Write a protein that binds this ligand. Sequence first.
Ligand SMILES: [Zn+2]
Lengths: 41, 39, 41, 38
Amino acid sequence: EEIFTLQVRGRERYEILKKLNDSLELSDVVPASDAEKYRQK
Amino acid sequence: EEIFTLQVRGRERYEILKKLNDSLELSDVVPASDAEKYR
Amino acid sequence: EIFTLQVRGRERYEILKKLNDSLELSDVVPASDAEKYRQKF
Amino acid sequence: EEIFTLQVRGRERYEILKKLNDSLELSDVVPASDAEKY
Ligand SMILES: [Zn+2]
């Protein structure tokens, strides 16, 4: 999945919230083994 | 000021980011002097 | 109840501290006060 | 490289910030090369 639109005022909050949102989405698709491997280097 | 929108997957995630948004806004409009006192 | 969050690196620390400081502020500003401050927008 | 600590009030807030931390650490190490791959 259900998809919501978050309204954000200004570039500063937008950039912070996009960064968080994009990070959370990345963690939903990178496999646990791949994630650990990236974290080692 | 410009309004941006973000597509958020999942209700729980939406509620966390909206809460951060609202708290970030508040922190941007409370002067530091007022904030230290409230703290 | 108070928890300690361990953070690696100054850039992640500054982002997380900003979020945490902001949440704490939203806790101690009364609702009517908060409303009057939001007018600026 | 520096290690930092943050005092968080309340377990649900701790859970939120911990997840953001863990996510952000992954985002910092996944290269651009592999971006379309996920
Ligand atoms: Zn600001």
